[PDB]
Amino acid sequence: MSQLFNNSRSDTLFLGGEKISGDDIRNQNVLATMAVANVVKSSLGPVGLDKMLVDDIGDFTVTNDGATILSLLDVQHPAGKILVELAQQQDREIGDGTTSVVIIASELLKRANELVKNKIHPTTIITGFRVALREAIRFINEVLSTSVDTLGKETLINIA
Amino acid sequence: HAASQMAKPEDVKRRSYRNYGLDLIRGKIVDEIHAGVLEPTISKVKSLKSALEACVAILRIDTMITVDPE
Amino acid sequence: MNFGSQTPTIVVLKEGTDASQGKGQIISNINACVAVQEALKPTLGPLGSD
Amino acid sequence: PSNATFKNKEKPQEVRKANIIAARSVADAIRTSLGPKGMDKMI
Amino acid sequence: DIRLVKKVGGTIDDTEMIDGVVLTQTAIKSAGGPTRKEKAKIGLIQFQ
Ligand SMILES: Nc1ncnc2c1ncn2[C@@H]1O[C@H](COP(=O)(O)OP(=O)(O)O)[C@@H](O)[C@H]1O
Numbered sequence: 001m002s003q004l005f006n007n008s009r010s011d012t013l014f015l016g017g018e019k020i021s022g023d024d025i026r027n028q029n030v031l032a033t034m035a036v037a038n039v040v041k042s043s044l045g046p047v048g049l050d051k052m053l054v055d056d057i058g059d060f061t062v063t064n065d066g067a068t069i070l071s072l073l074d075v076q077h078p079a080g081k082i083l084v085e086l087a088q089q090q091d092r093e094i095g096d097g098t099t100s101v102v103i104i105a106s107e108l109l110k111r112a113n114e115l116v117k118n119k120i121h122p123t124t125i126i127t128g129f130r131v132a133l134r135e136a137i138r139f140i141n142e143v144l145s146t147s148v149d150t151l152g153k154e155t156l157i158n159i160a
Numbered sequence: 161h162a163a164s165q166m167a168k169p170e171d172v173k174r175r176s177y178r179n180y181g182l183d184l185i186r187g188k189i190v191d192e193i194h195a196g197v198l199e200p201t202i203s204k205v206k207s208l209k210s211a212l213e214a215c216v217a218i219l220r221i222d223t224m225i226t227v228d229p230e
Numbered sequence: 231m232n233f234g235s236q237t238p239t240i241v242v243l244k245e246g247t248d249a250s251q252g253k254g255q256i257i258s259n260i261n262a263c264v265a266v267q268e269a270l271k272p273t274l275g276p277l278g279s280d
Numbered sequence: 281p282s283n284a285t286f287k288n289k290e291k292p293q294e295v296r297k298a299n300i301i302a303a304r305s306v307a308d309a310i311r312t313s314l315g316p317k318g319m320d321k322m323i
Numbered sequence: 324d325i326r327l328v329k330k331v332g333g334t335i336d337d338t339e340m341i342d343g344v345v346l347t348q349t350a351i352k353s354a355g356g357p358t359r360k361e362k363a364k365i366g367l368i369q370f371q
């Protein structure tokens with residue numbers, strides 16, 4: 001979505017790459033998130049379908065997991081590396097929901113960027129998510145269900 | 161789901177709704193207990209927290225500074 | 231029977247003609263209009279900028 | 281008046297102006313990182 | 324005198340106070356030694 005690249009500035013001289021500010025950064029960060037979120041969006045659920053990635057030596061890898069498909073996608077952008085390492089943190093800890101946690105984070109950065117354009121501060125936005133998540137975990141405790149009156153290993157079978 | 165949350169505590173049928181939802185094979189609303197769709201509670205716990213910290217790390221960024229390699 | 235060693239396949243469209251299917255192009259077209267929209271976003275109003 | 285000291289040098293005040301603008305340029309880069317409403321900077 | 328141990332993984336809420344010192348290093352476990360032992364006296368071997 002970003003066009004017309006930022007001009008090289010003579011008043012601010014920093015060694016290396018040029019500095020860029022404003023709303024273009026959060027637009028570029030969300031645009032970098034959609035580059036990886038659209039990849040994993042199709043391979044979600046039973047009806048979801050996956051893709052192939054070649055290793056430039058004839059070999060390839062048909063991958064369903066979010067941690068594996070992002071591990072081979074070496075993201076040069078800094079914001080994408082956070083989600084790449086998150087899936088490597090997700091699959092090692094729990095081993096489930098690797099595709100959903102990236103999809104949840106992508107949708108959050110979408111609407112969070114829309115809220116920043118609506119002129120509320122990110123600190124109030126982060127406080128809104130934390131108080132909401134604290135009530136969400138409290139609601140997850142309410143909707144629990146203890147396994148009872150089940151014949152044999154049926155609860156372990158159907159959950160697998 | 162809304163019709164279930166709003167409901168009286170004393171309403172069996174409505175409360176049950178709180179329990180079911182989307183089906184991807186047949187394309188209708190059926191019970192998850194009879195269908196067998198189930199997940200652990202630990203899978204959702206600490207998943208939104210990781211997504212929350214993932215959102216916080218990018219959302220708080222204002223400017224981007226890049227140093228070229230030597 | 232054949233005229234030569236091999237016979238490379240024909241591309242249907244002309245070489246260099248860009249084409250794409252799916253919902254990605256219409257999102258790119260909408261994002262292209264939003265990119266032009268952002269230039270005229272702060273211009274709207276009496277306190278806007280040239 | 282005509283007897284005033286011209287001092288022969290305008291290069292020092294010009295170099296000081298170039299340093300102040302260069303110092304204010306980086307000072308204005310981190311102005312929005314102050315207070316509870318500050319923002320992080322990933323380098 | 325303050326120590327901060329860096330580690331990947333976990334959540335921000337998992338940070339807690341430890342009354343005693345924590346070792347950043349891990350055990351060898353080549354010959355299959357124990358990993359847990361109660362009422363043990365810790366000796367510092369400064370030789371090879
Ligand atoms: N048979 C099924 N019926 C309904 N929903 C399902 C079924 N199988 C999987 N799902 C849903 O698909 C989502 C992702 O599942 P899966 O792809 O196995 O995990 P991951 O997101 O880690 O790849 C889950 O949140 C789950 O609710």
Ligand SMILES: [Mg+2]
Pocket residue numbers: 096097098
């Ligand atoms: Mg799964």
